[PDB]
Symmetry: D2
Subunit: 328 residues, 4 copies
């Protein structure tokens, strides 16, 4: 270990890894808007996640509009989130560009602004094979050794699922402490990737299947990721505590409740179609849940079949009732 390296390890990734959206002002869908981040809501939201018991906070994944925020907006938003968290929990800043050098340059500045790590996708103009994927993450880790890294394994967004041999290599990179994974959406690969990282990387399933992997692999699968904490974090923190207590019957009933709340999200049950518009559908979910306030999404992802927003709003309202139940 070097005094410059990140102090965070796989052991610090435990419990709920919450991913928040980037709150937006009412003119956020206009190309002429110079600055579209609602910074008051951002700070209140970040603080709400700490007080609600989120264990790790991440920003600006896909639905966080990593793609469409300006660099000025990304910096200001992350700095506001970091100041609001005040070091109480680790903060991973979502930084994904079209190439290795811009990602490195953004990652250094985000560390300067006090983020503890980076939630990093990968360039997607062309797909990267496994050798290309490992070289990218190693490049980022060597250039910014002071940042921990959460690997963004999103096959649709980045044009490919990260291979098991790539995970084995990623787990030798000390900065890599976690990966946002697919859970049962890629069930066989999740277990293959799990063996490949040998407890050196925390592989994060979904809130809707964390219990299944946690029971089967209690020593390894000790955290999940959730993009629904901004609808209210209480259903997921409670799942964390049910798992910790090994109340498997209670875990199953809560898990059924979460999937039930989210079922309307996918238009006509079509998951590939939800991914086509995940930014727009999630935004209507966050609005409807009423736990945070936000405006429209940013250019260019403003156009969506109106009926798809119906599924988002129902899912938000469904989750609101869960939040209210478990907020006690």
């Amino acid at each position: 270990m070097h005094v410059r390296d990140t102090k965070l390890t796989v052991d610090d990734i435990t419990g709920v890894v919450g991913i928040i959206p980037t709150p937006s002002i009412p003119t956020a869908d206009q190309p002429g808007t110079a600055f579209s981040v609602d910074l008051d809501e951002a700070a209140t939201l970040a603080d709400a996640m700490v007080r609600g018991g989120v264990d790790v906070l991440m920003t600006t994944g896909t639905f966080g509009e990593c793609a469409s925020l300006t660099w000025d907006e990304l910096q200001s938003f992350v700095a506001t989130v970091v100041d609001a968290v005040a070091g109480r929990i680790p903060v991973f800043a979502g930084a994904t560009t079209l190439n290795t050098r811009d990602t490195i340059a953004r990652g250094r500045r985000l560390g300067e602004l006090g983020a503890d790590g980076l939630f990093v996708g990968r360039p997607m103009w062309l797909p990267l094979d496994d050798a290309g994927i490992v070289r990218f993450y190693r490049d980022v880790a060597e250039a910014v050794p002071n940042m921990a890294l959460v690997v963004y394994d999103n096959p649709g967004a980045f044009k490919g699922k990260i291979g098991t041999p790539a995970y084995e290599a990623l787990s030798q990179i000390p900065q890599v402490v976690a990966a946002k994974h697919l859970g049962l959406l890629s069930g066989s690969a999740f277990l293959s990737d799990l063996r490949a990282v040998s407890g050196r990387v925390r592989l994060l399933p979904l809130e809707t299947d964390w219990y299944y992997f946690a029971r089967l692999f209690p020593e390894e699968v000790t955290a999940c990721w959730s993009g629904n904490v901004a609808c209210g974090p209480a259903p997921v923190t409670h799942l964390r505590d049910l798992i910790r207590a090994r109340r498997w019957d209670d875990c199953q009933a809560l898990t059924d409740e979460l999937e039930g709340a989210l079922e309307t999200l996918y238009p006509g049950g079509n998951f590939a179609e939800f991914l086509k518009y995940s930014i727009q559908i999630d935004n209507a979910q966050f609005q409807a849940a009423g736990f945070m306030r936000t405006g429209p999404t940013r250019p260019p992802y403003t156009e969506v079949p109106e009926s798809y927003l119906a599924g988002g709003r129902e899912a938000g309202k469904n989750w609101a009732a869960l939040q209210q139940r478990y907020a006690s």
Copy 2:
């Protein structure tokens, strides 16, 4: 300003020349600007009609902004007004593209060769809104629409082309030709002569003979291997020498057949930056270094295909430059 009428003949697309350490993530500026100038001047003197920079194989993805603006400025200055210059500008969102497009126009580019954000795919409505936004924000810039289904996660719809043909700034589209045969003809009908739809150099003769009033231009990503084969193809089409066009077309397809690993189109697209770079090196018409991070990994045998294609084309360049 530029209109559809200004896009005729060979629309050449050049790569971005690179210095020997271009493949290192710690290299801050990787463009060989002397080569960029020499290459652009060579395209003008070799008969290229319209010059475009920084599409996919131009490494629009992996250049830094400082690299892109300094490369565009050098190309525009070396061209010195002789032919139109379209700066390739493509980012992950509308607002960075507009901001890049404004500065690129301020640096003297005549237009923008624009692809669209692809983190999420855009539907026909989101695609039309993106190009309208750009055109309204940079009204002085003509626009070449970048229809690349694999890069941008979907083929631009015929209804989308219908709307794009109502935006005056949209003067041309880099299209797929026979790789999307039905769409090309459907799109060509939707734009109704208001947009120049550019097929491939290997497809151009077929579409020009069938639609001589509308398909009066193609694009070529091979001009940096030597533009003489394609400018010759242009003159043969203008003269309506269909036998000679067919024979030259077979020569062009013959030269490039090794570009595709096992003939597989889709494998080539996954590595088109790496494979094209090897072709430019071997053709020897220009010099360049390796590719930029992150696109430095590629099955070695795919590079052999690009090199042999580049050597094959260099032979065509020598044959047709002596006319």
Copy 3:
């Protein structure tokens, strides 16, 4: 066989299999309207169709019983009475059953076989060549039309396969894709070097025929059973090099058929081509048929409406070009 590539010229018409009103019931032992089949085949001869083909995809090659296929083919062959070549569509799950069906259809008087390939697993080019060579060697008295249908048979037939298929004497034509796969059409065309007739679409024929007049002397049409007059006229226009007329007619054909594809979605039409085409044949009123056979009976009603509207539009074209010989 006596047939060669030279015998494949003009309009290769593919017809559906006419059905009785109870054809959609699984308890219907025999569902072919044999009277209408004979009327249909005769009208194809009388209307100028140059080659007749039966039981492709929309002809329900999959869902007819073996007894239905034998009887339908016998009726068609007898009504054609040697006036034009007849290719019986025979496609099963394996080489041996296809060979068995091929020999029997030859005994009932068909001149050749319109053959797709086994589809349970995809065949690679070696497997594709072996299959057709097997069929050709076991039934050498039957000419062959290769059914190149990527969706049905799980892949596009490769250009090296076409090179090998062009050394088999029985192989005289291929039902191809035209501009739906334009680069491959021209690759396959070079490969066969005039030994196989590569049949594009009726909407594509003019383009390929103008560019390659010595080779692309024929197309296939699955619309003849709505009335063959527009397609045979297109043949006559191409033979007269009336290119402006060819372009105008091609537009009229594509125009009549635009409502075939729901919301313009070609892929969605292909999931229900049997059901939609059946609606088209009914509405066009050139032939009479009942419903489709099990298992292909379920379809959104909206998709049927688009097929019927296509049928009515083609009927107007049939009325126009059928009377162009005698009118004003």
Copy 4:
């Protein structure tokens, strides 16, 4: 029928169709080794297999003649002699041929049908339900195992189709995908609410049995013909809730089979699974069989080696646990 979901417990073994040495010749009219068919089926009973099924994908349902399929199923049925339920695999291109095959198969003594669906056009969820309802109604004396193979039949059965299928008493079980489609396995599982046995793979049965001990009380295995002892032993460990042992043995089964997928590519294996599995059955030595039937005889030779290695690795596990 008297068979219900309650009778589908333990190892559901799927066996291939033994072939004679000239089985790969299209002029061979009858290619089944019936003596080997009888010996294997008996060996499956004596080895602890709880349910036997024939003529799925690797059993070459596609490429056997009807006369072959009858004779093979009859021979298996006679050899089993009522000891365990036998599901005859019948999948044709249409409803009526499947039904008529299915009636004959019940007349030859099969207890039910292992049925995949017509695949020339893909069937949507309503067409899937109608197909299986039609078969169930035409031959109500026959229990049915639904064959959920998305590659073979052009689509994963939708969860709404499973909800409806679970109202058809004849439908007792489905050959499923386990962690290959884990999210859907669970959705389908909730939808059937214990009225249909959803069969995961032998390599993830332990995971699903531990989580759902009262529902997922059976798996399917396509490796029983390499020796059924490793899989019946897994059944016993699962019943005994010996989870540590279950995990280690699950790892052993995965380890023995890894050589099967060319360079770890599952989709590549599926393109040649009949050919590759054939190599594995020969190598394991538990049964003898000739080559595959037309048209699935072409396959890269290295893929076969990967199947041969898997056979030998499995034969070591068989010897270990047949102890």
